[model samples]
Target: TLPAVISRWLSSVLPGGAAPEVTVESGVDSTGMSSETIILTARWQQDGRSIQQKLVARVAPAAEDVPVFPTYRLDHQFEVIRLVGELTDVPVPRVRWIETTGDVLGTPFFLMDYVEGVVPPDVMPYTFGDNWFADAPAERQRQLQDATVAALATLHSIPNAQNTFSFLTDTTLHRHFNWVRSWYDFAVEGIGRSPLLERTFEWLQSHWPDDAAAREPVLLWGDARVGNVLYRDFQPVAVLDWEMVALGPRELDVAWMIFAHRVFQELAGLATLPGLPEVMREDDVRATYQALTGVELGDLHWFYVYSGVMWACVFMRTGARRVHFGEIEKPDDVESLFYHAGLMKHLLGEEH
Candidate 1:
């Protein structure tokens, strides 16, 4: 039934005089947490040549489904991806069509070419070992690591980023903090408070940076981590996930990139496995960024803890969803909700 609906919509957008033969290749389940991504293949006749196009449709979740973010700015995401491709050499998939009328799928959705590459696994993280990235030669791993940071350097170097991404005008470090606090407030409406999150918020407030350097803004990739990027030949071919995209300090993206890896690395340590500890090291990331941008990075301890707080909010909401769906029972101790609970404690200098 969904495929039939997409077929009818494809007919209106495609050049051929007939509707496309549409097939649903896959649908989002465990791969994504917020938006629903449906992989589609459409076949049609174009100038007597058989045309087959593989497209990924990103559909906003209906509010009734207990969505993650308070708002899903599908239009902003579409615009950001379009502008990133036009303004920078970032390897983003070409977005084709955007349907916001809600007439097609009862929600806003956008289509982009389905890029073929392997993304670092999230469920059983690459740091858990036995994966291509984990088993790769150290030199090759460094190549991917360096290239990934290079992409961030180039993206953050986009001149007039604030003016170019005018739609995200409200994005400032101060405003962004409040926004996260707001989201945390919204997240606990029914589920209840996280003691660790509350303490971390206090810690953040006390340790907040006020240097002029911290005020400098840049276009952040939002969810800047290897797990969100698709790789080939140990190089990032496509950067995915823009839901967290906002105008912020370069450190926001840089710290997230480093801290994300640390999360998996910590997990590997707990499992007594030798993770890619040589990869994505904070010193390496900072040095690489400095070499590329010529700007010295400031102390990132605060940002590192902030990254933990961000993940705490995400885990709170997503964990709530699992409980809502009867997949898992609600934990009496809210800190148990976080997969990074131990990591968060380590970052906060608290006893785990």
Candidate 2:
């Protein structure tokens, strides 16, 4: 039934007119976390020729029992990728078509060519695996870090942010907090408020930036990090995921990049990493970014903590989802955030 329905659904979108055979792959793609990626081959007949199209679909979450974020509209996700691909050098998948109605596949979704590349793993994390980055020498690792930072820098330099991402932000930074609060509220339906989380929220509120630091918002890849990219020979093949895409200060993205890598480095250090040393320090990354754009970076420590807080918020919800599926255990509040907020305490200078 689901297969039959998918067959009928994907069959309609074939570039050749009709696809009689459709096969959907079951696991998530390396670059996707928020959407169910359906990698299926669509074969149909047209002009008396046998035709097949291998495609992937990202379907937005639809179940009522699924307590998802208030933001993830399929239109936004689709548009972000499409426009970014057209308007920038950022590599992205070629979008095939968007199925806006849930009536067909039970949720709104978009189909794109299945981009082929080696993605750093999330399950075994490339930091911990024998794959790409793990196997590469220090030179290759440096190349990866440099190119990835250039990608981030060039994207931030995207002109016309007003039109490019104006759709993302319309109010106080509170709207961003509201998103966190919504996820937190839903996650605690069966649990109590996390005390550390409560204080972290308050810390963010107290530290809200004054107008001087709040300039015209630039494109903020909400989840800006290397793990979300697909790469080949140390260059980005495609950048994926748009659910967390937003409009904000360039710092929001810049700092998250550093924090994300540091998070991995910290974990790798714990697991006795295979030496990705060029990346563990912040100064090199800051210099790498500055050399490309001639822009001096500041206020990054704040966003580094902000990155930890946001990921902590996300881990909070994802832990609940995993618990619901019986996939993983719910760790103590501090442990669940991927560390006992060690990075946070270090950022606060308390750990030192």
Instruction: Give Cα distance to truth, residue 16, candidate 1, Å.
Output: 3.4
- For candidate 1, what is the TM-score? 0.93
* Candidate with the greatest TM-score versus the true structure: 1
- Please list the residue runs of candidate 2 whose C-alpha ends up more than 4 Å from where it truly belongs after superposition: 1-19, 28-35, 45-51, 63-71, 170-174, 211-213, 328-337, 350-352
lDDT of each: 0.83, 0.71
Model number with the top lDDT: 1
- Candidate 2 lDDT (Cα, whole model)? 0.71
Clash totals for all candidate models: 0, 0
lDDT of 1 by residue, 80-199 (tens): 999989988989989888877778778888888889998778778799987788888989989999999999999999998889987986338888899899889978974789878898
TM match of model 2 to true structure: 0.86
Candidate 2 lDDT over 1-352, as tens digits, reads 3446657766555554555777656535454444457677766787888877677777777544354454467777888888888888889899877777777777777877877787666667567757777787788878888888888888888888868676665443556667767767766663345776677777776776554155666677678888788898888988887778877767778888778777776777788875355663578888888899887766576677678877776666666666666666665553455563777866666321
Question: Positional deviation of 195 in candidate 1, in angstroms?
Answer: 1.7
